[PDB]
């Protein structure tokens, strides 16, 4: 495109199976998807970094001498991007000599388990490295993403940043990942999903994890969820994969991390799609639905009468 600025488009992420089990050493299976963020970076030669959150109509201006020394948690909505910048810069051992402006756009819903921040983070790390014509390998990128999440939050997990970085489908176990290709990835490439922001998650992940911590039956149901993953990996048709998703949902309910709203959306996903389940922690948030082409219009209609936001997406890569 004529005169284009540097622009990075990066994926969103969804956990298909093993949401709360991963915390205990079991497997999780996540996939990168079409809902993306876009980060544009260009020069301004005014000697200062300018951040622009177009979707929020917010802006931030910082001098070049302040970045390496800012504390990201002091800048609210700009913290991940700002942190991605500071971290990329000293990793590349660069001391900015010129200013730049960054514009951020995201189609990714916030706080419903999709990895809205990891995406801004990955796109930012890439934008900043590319802007200095010093592209990094997926190796260091995934690591810088991780370290950004760990700096902003007390701890972190590689899931978001690694799935978004390496894309496709990943098997996550103990903060280590195995990429999934072959026949399963192939199958997924033909699937069509619906991300449904059912309701505002009014509780933090730490809190949800605590509540899950206090279940007598937790470990027994985790095994079940893993038994489900075993089956999923060998899967071949949409009907079974669907039922397996529903099954994972029923199990997640058993950990009472679900809500009436989510469950109601899953029922609709079950009757008019092939299957469905909440995704991520469960203080509400969104549901993933496996679309049944033959009934898609019905699905969309029934969902429309519900107080929710709907997003079309497919595995990315």
Q: Please give the structure tokens belonging to residue 213.
A: 């911590």
In 10 A of CB 286, how many CB atoms? 27
213-214-220 Cα angle (round to 5): 75
Residues within the annotated binding site for ATP? 109-119
Distances from the Cα of 121 to the Cα of 79, 82, 117, 162, angstroms? 10, 9, 6, 11
Give how far Cα 243 sits from Cα of 71, 271, 276, Å: 46, 11, 8
CA distance linking residue 51 with residue 82, whole number of Å: 8
- Give all domains of the chain, ordered by start, each with its CATH number: 1-181 (3.30.230.10), 182-312 (3.30.70.890)
Structure tokens at 202: 């009014």
Q: How far apart are CA 268 and CA 190, in angstroms?
A: 22
What is the length of the chain?
317
Residue with tokens 């699937």: 191
**What residues have CB less than 8 Å from 138, skipping those under 6 apart?**
165, 166
Q: Is 160 annotated in the active site? A: yes
**Resolution stated for this PDB structure, in Å:** 2.4
Q: Binding-site residues, please? A: 109-119
Where is the chain discontinuous (C–N over 2.5 Å), named by the preceding residue?
A: none
- Whose tokens are 């950990």? That residue is 255
CA 317 from centroid of its chain's CA atoms:
15
User: Residues near 26 by Cβ (< 8 Å), separated by ≥ 6?
Assistant: 18, 173, 222, 223, 225, 226
Q: How far is 84 from 39, CA to CA, in rounded Å?
A: 12
111 burial (CB, 10 Å; 0-12 / 13-18 / 19+) is buried
Task: Give the torsion sign (CA, 126, 81, 313, 236).
Answer: positive
Contacts 24+ apart (CB under 8 A), 133-140: 134/92, 134/94, 136/92, 138/165, 138/166, 140/91
Pairing of strands 285-290, 169-172: unpaired
Question: What is the Cα–Cα distance from 45 to 51, expressed in whole angstroms?
Answer: 14
* Active-site option among 34, 90, 138, 160: 160
């Amino acid at each position: 495109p004529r005169g284009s600025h540097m622009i990075i488009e990066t994926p969103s992420k969804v956990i298909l199976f093993g949401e709360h089990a991963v915390v205990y050493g079991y497997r999780a299976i996540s996939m990168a998807i079409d809902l993306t963020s876009t980060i544009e970076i260009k020069e301004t030669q005014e000697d200062e970094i300018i951040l622009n959150l177009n979707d929020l109509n917010k802006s931030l201006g910082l001098n070049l001498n302040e970045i390496k020394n800012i504390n990201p948690n002091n800048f609210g909505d700009f913290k991940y991007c700002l942190c991605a910048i500071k971290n990329t810069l000293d990793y590349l051992n660069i001391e900015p000599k010129t200013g730049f402006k960054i514009n951020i756009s995201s189609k990714i819903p916030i706080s419903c388990g999709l990895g809205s921040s990891a995406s801004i983070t990955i796109g930012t790390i890439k934008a900043v490295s590319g802007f200095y014509n010093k592209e990094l390998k997926d190796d260091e990128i995934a690591k810088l993403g991780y370290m950004v999440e760990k700096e902003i939050q007390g701890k972190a997990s590689i899931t978001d940043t690694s799935t978004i970085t390496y894309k496709g489908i990943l098997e996550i176990k103990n903060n280590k990942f195995r990429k999934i290709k072959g026949e399963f990835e192939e199958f997924l490439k033909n699937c069509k999903f619906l991300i449904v922001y059912a309701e505002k998650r009014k509780k933090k992940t730490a809190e949800l994890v605590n509540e899950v911590a206090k279940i007598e039956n937790k470990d027994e149901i985790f095994k079940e969820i893993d038994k489900v993953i075993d089956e999923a990996l060998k899967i071949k048709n949409k009907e079974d994969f669907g039922k397996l998703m529903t099954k994972n949902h029923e199990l997640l309910k058993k950990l009472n991390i679900s809500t009436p709203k989510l469950d109601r959306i899953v029922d609709i996903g079950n009757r008019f799609g092939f299957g469905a389940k909440l995704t991520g922690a469960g203080g509400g948030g969104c549901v993933i639905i496996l679309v049944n082409e033959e009934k898609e219009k019905e699905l969309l209609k029934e969902l429309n009468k519900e107080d929710v936001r709907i997003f079309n997406c497919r595995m990315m890569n």
